[PDB]
């Protein structure tokens, strides 16, 4: 079965997949916005 | 700009520090954590 | 024994420090 | 430098120092890896820490 | 035999000879005690 | 002419914001009575 | 150097002045309202003077049950009413 | 050519006022959680659940006396995440069972995993040697030694150190009494790398700042320095002689006497971690065997060692009932020791 | 020259030289291995798996040989207590001899590698320099590791081509080397269950196999291979320096918590076992069980094991020694001999009265005596003038069933307060303190050292780690920075972006 | 006392194995060139 | 939880009344970036 | 006492008498002493990490520097261009004489303060006091960690010279 800590195990894996997929989206869709110029 | 002088500002800003660490103190001796 | 050693390694200690005063290496300006 | 005969029949697995695929090649492949490896490594340390507890699991002498 | 061309000198100066002198004479000055016990 | 809101901008913000609304939290703390 | 405006232009400017004169109080009285209103206590679980004991108890309430440990605080918390 | 992986390098590295890089993404959530976390939790915290304490503004504690208190004994070694089985999501719950202790520990380890990396990267970019960082794995040996392994080797979390002023110095008395750690060889070498590397930071700035060359005309003399000059500020070969003379050796190499300068204080903190590691076991140097031994036949003899086993003993006795509260302890008075009188 | 910290890097561009100094290396590790086990052997009293088991004689490889299955010796004993046994070869005295032996064929090998250092398999073919193909011979050694890591899990481990694992019962009372089957379900993660290990070795070594094959076949991306400097071989340092800390790590800490690879009757006890009274609640049980089956209270306790017993007493708690306390555990409280049995202390009115039992932080500890419900009744007191609780005024006795004293009652206040005394320590043993003049101080097991060696190992291995990283990607520096670096580099401002001359602003 | 019979040659290998390494590669640089 | 708007409406108030004096600037900031 | 162990029963007495550890001027004591030991492994390292290249890869690289030579066997502007990085570029010193100066000031003065707090608690002005300082609404008493603190001190004044004092107060 899918104890209690096992479903906890899921929302923390998933909490942190989401505040690190946030985190990379903005940092990617920032860099694109305000490029180095060469 | 620059329009409010510095030393104004950080006289200010002191004068600030000074009255809430003062009113931490002040709490040392009244309500709780005085020992009374 | 214990004593001995105790003495011993301080007294080589003494002896480094003569040495690494009065036989040391001179600074040279290069 | 000495030839021996196993040198000779060693030779071509000390032959391509320095040979790289183009670019990113598999790098890819590597993350999606490391991170199936990084989730595994967390599950067997909270189930040592019984922050996971699954069923028919006892962490214990009395396994 | 050919002689290998990877060989290097190697060198103490005195500073070094009595630095080290002092850290191991310290060490067991220090650590004797414990082993005695 | 110089940007307002930087990187520099969030980082004085996430100490400043909190440091004042913490420091009003510690005021009313003095005049708390058992 | 760097870019950004010199900090010392920013807080001797009018503008800065105009925003954060209502800024900072309006944060400073918000932390104030989350003590005075007991807001704190309850978001943190921090007794009040009046909850650390019941009125004739005097043994400390420890958790000493690691996986009832929040059931055994939510016990501790109900004895004092 | 420029990917987005390339593109997002571009922007981490921006020259700005506050460097990000890629050690940032690390770096900045993790140290800003730990330093927020121990602001949240001795402002409106209690450990009233977990050690029977007050320790936070909100109660009435002061900047010496508030902690983020480590959690209860029972909780053993778990690493009491907000949605794992102790809490079950419950903040305030989390709270009075001491998560904010594990979340200020974890996220502490990771932000200084953080910062080492930082100093790589930033040593990379400029162009230097990484010493810097080098010299920080003291700091993080130290950390790791006593806030991870020492409370790993023992029953539980509980008896890592509170992270407070006042905690703290409980955590110093504790390692006194119960562990003797004063005797510890390692904690010794760890005390000379500290007071050394004081010493020489003294003695480094002192000595050049009295055998400066005249470079300007003012009689305060820092502006007589220009940070591109070529030539050094301060006479070596006066400084050299002054030492020789005072002291009987000197330094005669600039390079060796910085180098010198991180390897006492790095060393030494090295060290301490060591017995740290021993103490996690209880692996202590508690005892002299030879000193007992004679101590028990002879009642006349006494040392200044075993004057302060007495004081451990006190310490143990007086301070364990309030101190270890899961254990339960009763100890009557008239078990307590005590000399005449006090 | 070199400073004398440097000597070794004139290896680093000499890879037949290399390969000699691991030799040597090796011959020496293996030597070790072979002297330690004759020194054992030439120590180790086998005459009393229950009260002088291994852990107790300060045995450190003795235990490791027993883990996968070397339990007898050429002179017909074994280390479960039985006679007249065969070990065959594979005695500890053969797999003593075998590492000797192995040593000597691994220092001839390195002679000849020292001297024929100049073999043209060592040179890239293309420019004649000297030249290791790092990324190859990494799938190459997988590879290799995968085919042992599996054969041991699916030969060794399993019994199908060999003996088997240590393995035993909750309270390590009947271990023995047993074939251990594979479990393949979520309780293979559990580090007590036997099975989970045969189930890694066989998984992790195909992995291994497959992981082989493609780093044999497939090159690093560009990217990778500059980005980890793969053709400089202190990055293979750096990051094997890494792994092993990493493993490290993970041995000190199966040691102290246990595992089905830290058996009991091999290591000795954990401290979390005194800690929570593991085996005392388990002899409880036995004899309550005893008792509502009509048993008297004298055949309860006699029918507890004196291995169980021994279990429950302090002075196997790993936790209860000192970082120069050296030797044996046999040296501190002596050679035990027999269980005294188990006292019960009562007063004048008959209570039964309970010692408070020291925990594992106190050097020292005082003699408390509580009812079934903590009050206290007894005590042995400091100050006399206001004593309450002494054994005198309470008059306390205490009675011994099952072990030694079984039957027997002492009432008079010296020996109940001695009785008291040992029972803060759990059961009760008669020590010889003779034969080794053991000095009556407490010394940790072999559990407890190998985890202090290898918390410490791991640490510094740490140092070792970032030191070679760093040396590894700051080679081009490190002599020093360039003499001509052009200050805009570190002003601020000048390039957009920081150490990258084509941004200019 | 009754001391630990090992202290002593544990101190005098301790002091003796290192202190020799230092002086052998200190007079082997003077002995240069 | 009425203390939550009460706590929450200062900081509210002030946000909104810095976003009011720095508008004009922002999106000139923004429409430069871009 | 001149020696190591009686080094450490003066210490131990010390808190026990004057609660040294909750002084402010012992505290300032610690902060120059670690500080000292933090600013010598960060100007070490500083240094260290730009010095400039004169020296092969076999070679040590303190040879690179020459007693009495006249130019400086570092790069300062590198070594500044890191540390104000690493931080940000004001909390660095980019004056030499500026940076020793703050080497030798802040441990010197944070040890005045360590002499300071034992010569003033030979006068027995001692470290703060909060023993039983939070009370709830009842009056019980609250304890916080200073009064742990207070536990272990008390431990070690009924110890210490066992057989001394025949009267209930430890007056000197
Ligand atoms: C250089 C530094 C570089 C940068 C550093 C970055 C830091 C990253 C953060 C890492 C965090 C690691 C958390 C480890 C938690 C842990 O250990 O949690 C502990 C658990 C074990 O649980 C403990 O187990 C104990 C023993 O129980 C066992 O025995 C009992 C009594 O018989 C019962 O039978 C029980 O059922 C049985 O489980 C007690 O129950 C304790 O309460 C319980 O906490 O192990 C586990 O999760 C896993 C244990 C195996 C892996 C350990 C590797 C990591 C730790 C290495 C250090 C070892 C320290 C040794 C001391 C020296
Ligand atoms: C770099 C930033 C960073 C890092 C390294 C950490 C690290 C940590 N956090 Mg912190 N945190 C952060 C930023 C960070 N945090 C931020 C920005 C916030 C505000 C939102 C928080 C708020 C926070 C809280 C409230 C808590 C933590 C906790 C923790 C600890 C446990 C984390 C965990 O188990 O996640 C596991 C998740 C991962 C490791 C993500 C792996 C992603 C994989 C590789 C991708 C796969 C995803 C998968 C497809 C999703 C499928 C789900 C589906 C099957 C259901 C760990 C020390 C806990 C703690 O400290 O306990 C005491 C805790 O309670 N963090
Ligand atoms: C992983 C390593 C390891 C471990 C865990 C063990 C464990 C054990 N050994 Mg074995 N042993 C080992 C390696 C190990 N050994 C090696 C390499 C040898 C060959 C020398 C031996 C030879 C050996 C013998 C002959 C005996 C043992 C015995 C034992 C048992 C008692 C241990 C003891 O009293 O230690 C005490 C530990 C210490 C006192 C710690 C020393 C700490 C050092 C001195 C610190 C040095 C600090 C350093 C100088 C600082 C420099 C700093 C600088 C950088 C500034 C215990 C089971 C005994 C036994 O009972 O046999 C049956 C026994 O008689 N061992
Ligand atoms: C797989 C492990 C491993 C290997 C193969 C190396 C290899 C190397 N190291 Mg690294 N290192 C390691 C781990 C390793 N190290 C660890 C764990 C640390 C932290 C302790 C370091 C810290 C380190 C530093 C600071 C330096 C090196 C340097 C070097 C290079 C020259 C070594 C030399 O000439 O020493 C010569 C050594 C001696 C002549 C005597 C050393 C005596 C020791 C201190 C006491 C006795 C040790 C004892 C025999 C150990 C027994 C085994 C142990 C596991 C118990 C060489 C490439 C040097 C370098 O980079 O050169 C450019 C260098 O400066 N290493
Ligand atoms: C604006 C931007 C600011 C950015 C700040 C960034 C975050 C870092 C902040 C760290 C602050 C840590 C100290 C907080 C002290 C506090 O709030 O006490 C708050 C307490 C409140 O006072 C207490 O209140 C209680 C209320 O129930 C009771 O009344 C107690 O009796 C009473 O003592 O004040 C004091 O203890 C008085 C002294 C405080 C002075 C502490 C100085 C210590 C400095 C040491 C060095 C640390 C480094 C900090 C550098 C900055
Ligand atoms: C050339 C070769 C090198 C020669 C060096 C000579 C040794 C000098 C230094 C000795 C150090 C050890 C002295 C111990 C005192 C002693 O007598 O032990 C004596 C002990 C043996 O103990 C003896 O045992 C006897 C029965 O066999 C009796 O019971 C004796 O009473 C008992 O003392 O020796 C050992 O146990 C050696 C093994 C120690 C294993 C330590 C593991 C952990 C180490 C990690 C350290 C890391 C530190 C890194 C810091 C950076
Ligand atoms: C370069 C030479 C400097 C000479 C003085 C040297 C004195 C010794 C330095 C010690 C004093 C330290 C304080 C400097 C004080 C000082 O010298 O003042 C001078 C400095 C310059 O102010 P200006 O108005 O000139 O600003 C100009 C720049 O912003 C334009 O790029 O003022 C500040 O930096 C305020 C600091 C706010 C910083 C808040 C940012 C928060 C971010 C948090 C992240 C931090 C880093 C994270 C990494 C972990
Ligand atoms: C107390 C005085 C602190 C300054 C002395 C520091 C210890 C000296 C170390 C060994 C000699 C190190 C050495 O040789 O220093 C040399 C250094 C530079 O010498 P100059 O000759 O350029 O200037 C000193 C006089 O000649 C006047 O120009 O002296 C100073 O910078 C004095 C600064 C005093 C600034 C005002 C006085 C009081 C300032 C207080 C500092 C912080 C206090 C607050 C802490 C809570
Ligand atoms: C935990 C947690 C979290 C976080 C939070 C945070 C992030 C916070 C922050 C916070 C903060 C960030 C706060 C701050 C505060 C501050 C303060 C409270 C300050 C004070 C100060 C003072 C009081 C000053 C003093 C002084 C000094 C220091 C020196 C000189 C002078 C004087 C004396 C003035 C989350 C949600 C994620 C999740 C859950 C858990
Ligand atoms: C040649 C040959 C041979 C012979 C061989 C042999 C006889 C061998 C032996 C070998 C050996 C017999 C070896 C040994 C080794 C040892 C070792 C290698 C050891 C080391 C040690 C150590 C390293 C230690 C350290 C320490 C100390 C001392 C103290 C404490 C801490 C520590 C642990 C760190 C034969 C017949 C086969 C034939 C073929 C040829
Ligand atoms: C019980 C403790 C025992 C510890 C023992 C430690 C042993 C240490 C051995 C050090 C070996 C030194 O190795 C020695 O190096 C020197 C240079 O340094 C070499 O010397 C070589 O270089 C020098 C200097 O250019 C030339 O003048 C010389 O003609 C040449 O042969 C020697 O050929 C070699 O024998
Ligand atoms: C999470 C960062 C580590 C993984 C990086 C993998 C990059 S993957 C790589 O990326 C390029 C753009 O950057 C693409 O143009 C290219 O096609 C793709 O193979
Ligand atoms: C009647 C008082 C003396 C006998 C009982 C005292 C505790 S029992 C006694 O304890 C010693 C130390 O553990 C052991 O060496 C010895 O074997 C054991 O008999
Ligand atoms: O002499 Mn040394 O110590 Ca100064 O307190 Mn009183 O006196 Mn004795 O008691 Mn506590
Ligand atoms: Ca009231
Ligand atoms: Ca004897
Ligand atoms: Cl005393
Ligand atoms: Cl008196
Ligand atoms: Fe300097
Ligand atoms: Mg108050």
Request: proline fraction near 5%; aromatic fraction near 16%.
């Amino acid at each position: 079965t899918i104890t209690p800590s096992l479903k906890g195990f899921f929302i923390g894996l998933l909490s942190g997949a989401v505040v690190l997929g946030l985190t990379f989206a903005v940092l990617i869709a920032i860099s694109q916005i305000d490029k180095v110029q060469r | 700009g620059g329009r409010i002088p510095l030393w104004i500002v950080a006289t200010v800003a002191g004068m600030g520090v000074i009255v809430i660490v003062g009113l931490f103190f002040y709490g040392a001796y009244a309500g709780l954590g005085s020992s009374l | 024994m214990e004593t001995i050693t105790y003495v011993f390694i301080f007294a080589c200690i003494i002896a480094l420090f003569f040495f690494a005063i009065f036989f040391r290496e001179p600074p040279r300006i290069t | 430098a000495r030839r021996t005969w196993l040198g000779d029949i060693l030779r071509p697995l000390n032959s391509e120092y320095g040979k790289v695929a183009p670019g990113w090649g598999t790098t890819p492949l590597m993350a999606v890896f490391m991170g199936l490896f990084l989730v595994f490594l967390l599950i067997i340390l909270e189930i040592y820490n019984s922050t996971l507890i699954l069923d028919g699991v006892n962490v214990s002498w009395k396994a | 035999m050919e002689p290998n061309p990877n060989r290097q000198p190697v060198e103490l100066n005195r500073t070094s000879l009595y630095l080290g002198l002092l850290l191991i004479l310290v060490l067991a000055l220090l650590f004797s005690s414990y082993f005695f016990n | 002419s110089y940007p307002i809101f930087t990187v520099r901008w969030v980082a004085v913000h996430t100490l400043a914001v909190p440091t004042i609304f913490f420091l009003g939290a510690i005021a009313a703390m003095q005049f708390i009575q058992r | 150097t760097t870019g950004e405006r010199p900090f010392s232009d920013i807080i001797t400017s009018v503008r800065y002045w105009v925003i954060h004169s209502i800024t900072i109080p309006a944060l400073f009285i918000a932390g104030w309202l989350f003590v005075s209103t007991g807001l704190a206590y309850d978001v943190f679980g921090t007794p009040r003077p009046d909850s650390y004991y019941a009125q004739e108890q005097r043994s400390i309430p420890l958790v000493t049950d690691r996986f009832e440990a929040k059931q055994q605080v939510e016990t501790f918390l109900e004895q004092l009413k | 050519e420029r990917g987005w992986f390339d593109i997002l390098d571009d922007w981490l590295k921006r020259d700005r006022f506050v460097f990000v890089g890629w050690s940032g993404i690390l770096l900045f959530p993790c140290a800003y959680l730990a330093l927020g976390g121990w602001l949240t939790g001795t402002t409106f915290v209690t450990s009233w659940y977990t050690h029977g304490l007050a320790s936070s503004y909100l109660e009435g504690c002061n900047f010496l006396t508030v902690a983020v208190s480590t959690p209860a004994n029972s909780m053993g070694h778990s690493l009491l995440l907000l949605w794992g089985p102790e809490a079950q999501g419950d903040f305030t719950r989390w709270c009075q069972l001491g998560g904010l202790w594990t979340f200020i520990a974890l996220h502490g380890a990771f932000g200084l995993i953080g910062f080492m990396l930082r100093q790589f990267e930033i040593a990379r970019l400029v162009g230097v040697r990484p010493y810097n960082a080098i010299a920080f794995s003291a700091p993080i040996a130290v950390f790791v030694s006593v806030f991870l392994i020492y409370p790993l080797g023992q029953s539980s979390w509980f008896f890592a150190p509170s992270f407070g002023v006042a905690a703290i110095f409980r955590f110093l008395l504790f390692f006194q009494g119960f562990h003797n750690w004063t005797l510890n060889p390692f904690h010794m070498m760890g005390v000379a790398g500290v007071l050394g590397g004081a010493l020489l930071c003294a003695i480094h700035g002192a000595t050049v700042e009295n055998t400066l060359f005249q470079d300007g005309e003012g009689a305060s003399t820092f502006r007589a320095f220009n940070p591109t000059q070529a030539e050094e500020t301060y006479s070596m070969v006066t400084a050299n002689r002054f030492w020789s003379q005072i002291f009987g050796i000197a330094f005669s190499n600039k390079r060796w006497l910085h180098f010198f300068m991180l390897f006492v204080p790095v060393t030494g903190l090295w060290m301490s971690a060591i017995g740290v590691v021993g103490l996690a076991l209880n692996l202590r140097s508690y005892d002299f065997i030879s000193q007992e031994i004679r101590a028990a036949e002879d009642p006349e003899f006494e040392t200044f060692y075993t004057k302060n086993l007495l004081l451990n003993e006190g310490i143990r006795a007086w301070m364990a009932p309030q101190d270890q509260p899961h254990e339960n302890f009763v100890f009557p008075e008239e078990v307590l020791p005590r000399g005449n009188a006090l | 020259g070199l400073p004398w910290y440097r000597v070794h890097t004139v290896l680093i561009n000499d890879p037949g030289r290399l390969i000699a100094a691991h030799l040597m290396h090796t011959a020496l590790v293996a030597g070790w291995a072979g002297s330690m086990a004759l020194y054992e052997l030439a120590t180790f009293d086998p005459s009393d798996p229950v009260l002088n088991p291994m852990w107790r004689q300060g045995m450190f490889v003795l235990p490791f040989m027993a883990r996968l299955g070397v339990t007898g010796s050429w002179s017909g004993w074994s280390i479960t207590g039985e006679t007249g046994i065969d070990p065959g070869f594979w005695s500890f005295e053969g797999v003593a001899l075998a590492h000797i032996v192995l040593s000597g064929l691994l220092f001839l090998a390195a002679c000849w590698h020292w001297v024929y250092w100049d073999l043209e398999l060592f040179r890239d073919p293309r420019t004649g320099e000297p030249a290791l193909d790092l990324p190859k011979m990494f799938g190459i050694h997988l590879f290799l590791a995968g085919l042992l890591c599996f054969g041991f899990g699916a030969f060794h481990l399993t019994g199908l081509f060999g003996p088997g694992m240590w393995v035993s019962d909750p309270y390590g009372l009947t271990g023995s080397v047993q074939p251990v089957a594979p479990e393949w379900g979520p309780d293979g993660f559990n580090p007590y269950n036997p099975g989970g290990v045969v189930a890694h070795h066989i998984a992790a070594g195909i992995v291994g196999i497959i992981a082989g094959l493609f780093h044999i076949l497939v090159r690093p991306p560009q990217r990778l291979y500059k980005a980890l400097r793969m053709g400089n071989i202190e990055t293979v340092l750096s990051s094997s320096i890494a792994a092993v800390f990493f493993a490290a790590f993970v041995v000190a800490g199966t040691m102290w918590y246990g595992s089905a690879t830290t058996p009991i009757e091999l290591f000795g006890p954990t401290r979390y076992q005194w800690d929570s009274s593991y085996f005392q609640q388990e002899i409880n049980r036995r004899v309550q069980a005893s008792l509502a089956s009509g048993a008297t209270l004298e055949e309860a306790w006699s029918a507890i094991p004196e291995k169980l017993a021994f279990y429950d007493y302090i002075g196997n708690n790993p936790a209860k020694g000192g970082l120069f306390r050296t030797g044996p555990m046999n040296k501190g409280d002596g050679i035990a001999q027999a269980w005294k049995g188990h006292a019960v202390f009562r007063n004048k009115e008959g209570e039964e009265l309970f010692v408070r039992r020291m925990p594992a932080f106190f050097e020292s500890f005082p003699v408390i005596l509580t009812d079934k419900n903590g009050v206290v009744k007894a005590d042995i007191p400091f100050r006399r003038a206001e004593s309450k609780y002494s054994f005198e005024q309470q008059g306390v006795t205490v009675s011994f069933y099952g072990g030694e004293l079984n039957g027997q009652t002492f009432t008079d206040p010296p020996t109940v307060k001695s009785y008291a005394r040992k029972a803060i320590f759990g059961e009760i043993f008669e020590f010889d303190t003779e034969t080794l003049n053991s000095d009556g101080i407490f010394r940790t097991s072999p559990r407890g050292w190998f985890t202090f060696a290898h918390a410490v190992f791991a640490l510094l291995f740490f140092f070792g780690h970032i030191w070679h990283g760093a040396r590894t990607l700051f080679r081009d520096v490190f002599s020093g920075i360039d003499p001509e670096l052009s200050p805009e580099q570190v002003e601020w401002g000048f390039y957009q972006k920081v150490g990258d001359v084509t941004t200019r602003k | 006392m009754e001391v630990n019979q090992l202290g002593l040659i544990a101190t005098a290998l301790f002091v003796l194995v290192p202190s020799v390494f230092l002086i052998i590669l200190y007079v082997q640089t003077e002995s240069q060139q | 939880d009425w203390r939550v708007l009460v706590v929450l409406l200062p900081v509210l108030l002030a946000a909104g009344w810095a976003v009011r004096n720095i508008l004009p600037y922002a999106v000139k900031q923004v429409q430069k970036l871009l | 006492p001149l020696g190591i162990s009686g080094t450490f029963n003066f210490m131990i007495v010390f808190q026990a008498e004057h609660n040294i550890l909750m002084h402010p001027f012992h505290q300032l004591g610690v902060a120059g002493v670690f500080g000292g030991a933090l600013f010598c492994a960060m100007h070490g390292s500083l240094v260290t990490s730009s010095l400039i290249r004169e020296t092969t890869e076999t070679e040590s690289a303190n040879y690179g520097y020459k007693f009495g030579q006249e130019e400086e066997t570092y790069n300062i502007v590198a070594a500044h261009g890191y540390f104000g990085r690493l931080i940000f570029q004001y909390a660095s010193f980019n004056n030499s004489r500026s940076l020793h100066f703050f080497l030798a000031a802040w441990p010197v003065v944070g040890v005045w303060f360590a002499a300071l707090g034992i010569s003033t608690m030979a006068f027995n002005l001692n470290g703060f006091n909060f023993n039983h300082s939070v009370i709830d609404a009842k009056g019980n008493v609250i304890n916080t960690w200073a009064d742990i603190i207070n536990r272990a001190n008390l431990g070690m004044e009924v110890m210490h010279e066992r057989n001394a004092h025949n009267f209930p107060l430890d007056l000197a």
